[PDB]
């Protein structure tokens, strides 16, 4: 979320607050298990990696 | 209005102050006690100079001095 | 001592002039170590 | 010469409407045209209007991305508080920028602790104040005695946002010009 | 042709040589007055806000003083790592090197030899000094009594020089007993140096715990009898929850109340978690609020609030105990006792006066006298005297002083000079008579006779004695070990390490070339 | 103690001022302030307990030792209902009388009509219930810190203590809240 439009998180319960902040970790994530499941061995981007 | 006029305008005609309207109660109400009381006011015009004149305070007695002269800078004199 | 009243010498302790002893104390300590401090100094020298 | 000018320049859209039985159609309607689209200009550079609570790793994007914006030069101003709890200037600036933030959406106010933003920073030195822009830092102030210290207001703040050109001289929301409407009321009576 | 453009300064091998010398004549010559004992302080004023600053360390000196010349930024740079090394002799550094170019300045032009050739016979005549440092040294530390007189003796010989020379008698105990409290630890954070104005030079006193300037509460008692001391680099301020992001939304001001109602039952009990632990006083890095501090009150707990960052360490290590913050387990972090905590007043502050600790590994000086600029060289005396005798507690070999170390080195640089050929003997004798000035120097400040002294001294140690040396008192040759005057081993090695680099450094010039400046 | 040592020395040794003419009543003046603190140990008396209070006017002869502690700050005045006191119970107050808020900033919604009934009724109420405490408490005076980060008092809270002839002052200085409380006695609160 560095060049992402700000979203406008809005959260009633502090149980819900450990899965929005997992779920940042959790989508980061599976865009790397499913680059790591096809073998690139070399990645390269336009834009920055993380 | 300014603060330091209506203390006497209140401390004259026998009201009293309001800066809001409350109790000690939870409800919101005005009680006729807070009124004071006067014989007569008649709003006169003098020269572009208009002024409330409010006369016979039962409570207590009040006086105003409305002095007549040339010009504001004159008057500043006779003010003083 | 001196009185300034009279203009003149007389006894200080009839006329009720006294002081504490370490405001003098303090004044010859105080003095001595000013003295010391600049007799030491030699030079100067302008800095930022 | 200032009196044609005066007409259109010292009137908003809505104070621009006075002249519509008075002066003609095509005068008032073609500048309102033009004032209109400055309106619809700050709307859409309305980005921000809360304090963005942040922290170090993003510093270096929240900070200064933003500061370059479209990189067309759409700058984008970021006002950055060191926080520290602890002081008293440092609670009375966070109040300044979520004050400031409602009214100037378009600038961006920053905040973060002193302690979490600089290795071993001097505590006295805080609050701290930095204004980005472009990447390059603005102005590097230093605790709030210049602006009155303890008795900081509300208007010192919107004057010194005028000064690194954040701010129009003549904008309307600020406390200088936004007249109150009882203090306008007076005025056309006693015209 | 003008590559270098407008306004550049260049020099080529007559004006770039002898620029340097005569600036390294011109640094040497303002240190000469406050090397030795009997030596002139040197007043510096500055430019800008009438600050004035008295001050004897060649360092302090040259950090002031603005100083354009090239080669006397090096002899500014050398004096500054002397002091961030040891804190003693950046002036001996600054004369030897001088010197050392002084005399250099005439073999390159009297006896013609090449400025390579000078350097090699440094690098034995140097190789020669220190052996004969490291052989002349002795052994210490094996009998803590010889270990507490030795350093008792190298703060005399520090302080001789300082303004502190007439009452160096007392202040060699203040300076020794702090350091033996530190059990080992080199670490000069742990001492602190309390500014008051008033009394004389010899009213310092040895203080028996830690001391600080601070203050108690609005509502705290004055006196409390075995007080446990609890140190908190915690907020007792206005907490937050620190998950930042955190707003209240409200419906109803009936819940804001009850609200408002729970952020002060949330640190109350955090406070009631202070009391089951039963402290006496409590210790905390930032400000207190108001409301914390009342709910001390009741409880019989000081408070003491805005503790800067070292002084946490200087007050935790005096108590023994470590810094808590969590508060949840009472089992671990055991602390401290303190049996005295009534504050004292020394002038116009009160200060917090603490006495019977469980142990005294910081410690704290406390001085007197008339003009801040007498405390300011008090400053700086004594932390040049507890630099050099908190690093004698980690490098034992100390040396003789009183000139003798610069003589006893000349004796092998001169007996290793003879079975040198070639040219560069001249540079090895030339390295000896840079040791030799050193005393020279002694003398000269003192007002007695040098040429007398160095020669009665030189030809008495090469007779076979070497515990001769220089007694300024009486103006004549005297037992050092009688006296009692001696100096770290490291000291002079650094000195000479550093004088032989400094010579080096700028012997191997040739051009200068100065840019435009902004 | 001595008063024919301690009086004579302390006017023939201020001697140069304008005051040493008045030194006749000024003189056991300073020898009554430090004789009320008195230690065998001969302590470094502080002279934070001995407080001089600058106040422009009138002439230096109606200098006098006031028995209790003066304050220099005036009163507020906004409503003005007590003037003159007589056994009154100080009281010092370190929070601040407000709405009710914490310390930072809040967000308060209203998704209905209704809702404001109840907000503006329960904002006076947190300032009736304190004034209730007050009551019981009987508390006649009142010291409110200067408190420039959040509001002191409002025309709200100052109509309910207008009622109950209960003065209110501002602007007090943080270090002076040692001289009051060891002065009037009175220790301070911080919460209701
Ligand atoms: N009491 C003394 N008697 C004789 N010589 C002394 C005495 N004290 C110091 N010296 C000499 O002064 C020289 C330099 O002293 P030092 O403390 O390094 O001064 P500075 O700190 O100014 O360099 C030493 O080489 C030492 O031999
Ligand atoms: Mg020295
Ligand atoms: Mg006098």
């Known amino acids: 979320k560095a060049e992402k439009d700000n979203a406008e998180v809005r959260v009633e319960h502090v149980e819900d607050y450990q899965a929005i902040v997992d779920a940042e970790w959790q989508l980061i994530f599976e865009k790397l298990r499913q680059v790591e499941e096809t073998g690139a061995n070399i990645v390269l981007s336009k834009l920055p990696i993380g | 209005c300014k603060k330091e006029d209506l203390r006497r305008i209140a401390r004259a005609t026998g009201a009293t102050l309001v800066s809001s309207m409350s109790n000690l109660e939870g409800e919101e109400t005005f009680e006729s006690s807070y009124l004071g009381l006067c014989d007569e006011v008649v709003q006169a015009k003098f020269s572009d100079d208009e002024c409330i004149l409010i006369k016979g305070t039962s409570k207590h007695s009040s006086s105003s001095i409305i002095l007549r002269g040339a010009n504001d800078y004159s008057l500043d004199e006779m003010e003083r | ?48 | 010469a200032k009196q044609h000018e005066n007409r259109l320049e010292d009137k908003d859209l809505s104070d621009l409407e006075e002249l519509e039985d008075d002066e003609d159609e095509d005068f008032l309607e073609a500048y309102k045209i033009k004032r209109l689209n400055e309106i619809r200009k700050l709307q859409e550079r309305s980005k921000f209007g809360e304090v963005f609570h942040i922290n170090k790793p993003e510093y270096n994007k929240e900070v200064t991305l933003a500061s370059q914006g479209k990189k067309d030069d759409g700058g984008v101003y970021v006002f950055v508080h060191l926080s520290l709890q602890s002081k008293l200037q440092s609670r009375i600036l966070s109040h300044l920028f979520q004050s400031a933030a409602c009214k100037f959406r378009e600038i961006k106010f920053v905040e973060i602790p002193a302690n979490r933003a600089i290795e071993n920073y001097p505590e006295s030195n805080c609050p701290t104040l930095i204004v980005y822009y472009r990447g390059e830092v603005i102005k590097n102030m230093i605790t709030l005695l210049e602006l009155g210290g303890n008795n900081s207001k509300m208007e010192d703040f919107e004057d010194f946002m005028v000064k690194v050109g954040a701010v129009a001289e003549g904008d309307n929301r600020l406390i200088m010009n936004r007249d109150d409407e009882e203090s306008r009321e007076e005025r056309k009576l006693h015209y | 042709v003008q590559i270098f453009g407008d306004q550049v300064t260049e020099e080529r091998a007559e004006n770039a040589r002898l620029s340097a010398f005569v600036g390294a004549i011109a640094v040497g010559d303002l240190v000469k007055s406050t090397l030795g004992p009997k030596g002139m302080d040197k007043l510096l004023q500055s430019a800008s806000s009438n600050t004035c600053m008295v001050t004897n360390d060649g360092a302090t000196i040259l950090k002031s003083i603005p100083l354009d010349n090239p080669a006397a930024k090096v002899l500014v740079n050398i004096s500054k790592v002397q002091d961030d090394e040891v804190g003693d002799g950046t002036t001996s550094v600054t004369v030897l090197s001088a010197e050392l170019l002084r005399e250099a300045e005439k073999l390159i032009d009297q006896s013609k030899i090449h400025p390579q050739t000078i350097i090699e016979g440094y690098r034995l005549a140097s190789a020669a000094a220190l052996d004969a440092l490291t052989k002349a040294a002795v052994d210490n530390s094996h009998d803590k009594t010889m270990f507490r007189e030795d350093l008792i003796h190298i703060a005399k010989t520090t302080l001789s020089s300082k303004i502190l020379s007439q009452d160096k008698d007392h202040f060699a105990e203040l300076a020794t007993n702090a350091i033996l409290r530190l059990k080992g630890s080199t670490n000069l954070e742990h001492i602190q140096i309390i500014k008051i104005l008033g009394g004389k030079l010899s009213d310092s006193f040895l203080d028996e715990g830690f001391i600080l300037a601070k203050k108690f509460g609005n509502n705290q008692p004055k006196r409390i009898e075995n007080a446990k001391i609890l140190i908190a680099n915690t907020t007792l301020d206005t907490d937050k929850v620190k998950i930042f992001g955190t707003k209240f939304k409200v419906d109803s001001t009936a819940k804001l109340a009850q609200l408002e109602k729970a952020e002060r039952e949330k640190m109350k009990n955090k406070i009631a978690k202070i009391s089951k632990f039963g402290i006496n006083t409590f210790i905390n890095r930032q400000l207190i609020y108001d409301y914390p501090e009342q709910l001390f009150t009741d409880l019989g707990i000081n408070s003491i609030e805005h503790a800067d960052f070292e002084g946490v360490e200087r007050l935790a290590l005096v108590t023994g105990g470590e810094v808590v913050s969590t508060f949840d387990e009472p089992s671990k972090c055991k602390l401290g006792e303190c049996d005295v905590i009534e504050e004292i007043m020394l002038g116009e502050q009160p200060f917090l006066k603490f006495s019977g600790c469980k142990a005294g590994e910081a410690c704290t000086i406390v001085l007197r006298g008339a003009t801040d600029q007498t405390l300011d060289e008090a400053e700086r005396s004594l932390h040049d005297a507890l630099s050099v005798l908190s690093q004698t507690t980690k490098e034992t070999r100390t040396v003789l002083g009183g000139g003798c170390a610069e003589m006893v080195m000349s004796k092998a640089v001169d007996t290793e000079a003879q079975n040198i050929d070639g040219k560069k003997s001249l540079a090895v004798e030339a390295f000896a008579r840079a040791l030799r000035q050193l005393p020279t120097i002694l003398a000269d400040n003192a007002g007695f006779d040098s040429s007398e002294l160095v020669s009665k001294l030189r030809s008495s140690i090469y007779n076979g004695i070497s515990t001769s040396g220089l007694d300024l008192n009486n103006g004549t040759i005297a037992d050092m070990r009688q006296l009692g005057i001696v100096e770290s081993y490291k000291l002079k090695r650094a000195v000479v390490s550093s004088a032989s680099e400094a010579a080096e450094v700028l012997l191997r010039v040739d051009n200068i070339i100065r840019a435009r400046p902004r | 103690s001595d008063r024919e040592q301690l009086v004579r020395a302390a006017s023939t040794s201020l001697s140069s001022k304008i005051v040493s003419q008045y030194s006749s009543f000024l003189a056991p003046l300073a020898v009554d302030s430090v004789l009320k603190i008195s230690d065998e140990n001969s302590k470094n008396v502080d002279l934070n307990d001995i407080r001089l209070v600058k106040k422009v006017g009138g002439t230096i002869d109606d200098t006098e030792m006031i028995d209790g502690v003066v304050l220099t700050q005036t009163a507020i005045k906004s409503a003005g209902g007590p003037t003159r006191k007589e056994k009154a119970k100080i009281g010092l107050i370190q929070f601040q009388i407000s709405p009710p808020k914490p310390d930072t900033e809040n967000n308060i919604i209203v998704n209905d009509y209704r809702q404001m009934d109840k907000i503006l009724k329960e904002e006076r109420a947190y300032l009736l219930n304190i004034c209730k405490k007050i009551k019981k408490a009987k508390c006649n005076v009142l010291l409110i810190q200067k408190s420039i980060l959040r509001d002191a008092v409002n025309d709200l809270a100052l109509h309910f203590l207008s009622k109950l002839n209960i003065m209110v002052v501002k602007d007090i200085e943080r270090e002076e809240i040692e001289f009051l409380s060891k002065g009037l006695g009175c220790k301070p609160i911080a919460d209701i």
């Not at chain 3, 009279?6 to 002893?21: A, C, D, F, K, W």
């Not at chain 3, 405001?23 to 302008?46: G, Q």
């Open chain 3, 1 to 48: 001592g001196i009185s300034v009243r009279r203009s003149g010498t007389t006894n200080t302790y009839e006329e009720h002039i006294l002081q504490p002893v370490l405001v003098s104390t303090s004044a010859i300590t105080l003095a001595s170590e000013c003295v010391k401090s600049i007799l030491r100094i030699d030079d100067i020298a302008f800095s930022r």
